[PDB]
């Protein structure tokens, strides 16, 4: 489905947002 | 194809839940 | 595919592991 | 079906990356 496509794209996209939040927390605590 | 898509929706829901958890953690950390 | 099935199951499974790690961090910082 | 599966593998890889980030965060937090 192009339905699974779109959901797969959002999923990736939140996953990069989560990795960035964690990277940010890691940076901040390292200071 | 439908169990897969049902699965994707489920996966996205858990990401939202992880985002709520990170929202709380960020507040606790003074960030 | 029963291939997408298995990957979908592991994906969920790491997602519950991540939610539990974060829950744990949230608990610990709340103390 | 193959782009979806290629997608799943990608998604799992990002979860592993989030787990490495949480491993580091946990060490920083004294946990
Ligand atoms: Cl959805
Ligand atoms: Cl894989």
UniProtKB/Swiss-Prot annotation, chains A, B, C, D:
Belongs to the bZIP family. GCN4 subfamily. It comes from Saccharomyces cerevisiae (strain ATCC 204508 / S288c). Phosphorylated by the cyclin-CDK PCL5-PHO85. It is found in: Nucleus. This is General control transcription factor GCN4. Master transcriptional regulator that mediates the response to amino acid starvation. Binds variations of the DNA sequence 5'-ATGA[CG]TCAT-3' in canonical nucleosome-depleted 5'-positioned promoters, and also within coding sequences and 3' non-coding regions. During nutrient starvation (low or poor amino acid, carbon or purine sources), it activates genes required for amino acid biosynthesis and transport, autophagy, cofactor biosynthesis and transport, mitochondrial transport, and additional downstream transcription factors. Homodimer. Each subunit binds overlapping and non-identical half-sites that flank the central CG base-pair in the pseudo-palindromic motif 5'-ATGA[CG]TCAT-3'. Interacts with the mediator tail; the interaction with GAL11/MED15 is direct. Interacts with the SAGA histone acetyltransferase complex. Interacts with the SWI/SNF chromatin remodeling complex. Residues 4-25 are annotated as: Leucine-zipper. Residues 89 to 100 and 106 to 125 define the N-terminal activation domain (NTAD) and the central acidic activation domain (CAAD) respectively, which can function independently to promote high-level transcription of the target genes. Induction: Translation is induced by amino acid or purine starvation, or during growth in low or poor carbon sources. Translational repression during nutrient-rich conditions is dependent on four uORFs (upstream open reading frames) present in the 5'-UTR of the mRNA; these promote ribosome dissociation. Translational induction occurs in conditions reducing translation machinery efficiency, leading to ribosomes scanning over the uORFs, and increased translation of the mRNA. The rapid translational induction is followed by transcriptional induction at later time-points, independently of the uORF sequences. The chain holds residues 250 to 280 of 281 of the full protein. Disruption phenotype: Abolishes recruitment of the mediator complex to the upstream activating sequence (UAS) of amino-acid starvation responsive genes. Decreases RNA level of genes involved in amino acid biosynthesis and cofactor biosynthesis during amino acid starvation or methyl methanesulfonate stress. Growth dependent on amino acid supplementation. Sensitive to amino acid starvation. Sensitive to purine starvation. Decreases cellular glycogen levels during glucose starvation.
């Amino acid at each position: 489905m192009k339905q699974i496509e779109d959901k797969s794209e959002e999923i990736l996209s939140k996953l990069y947002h989560i990795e960035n939040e964690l990277a940010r927390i890691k940076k901040l605590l390292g200071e």
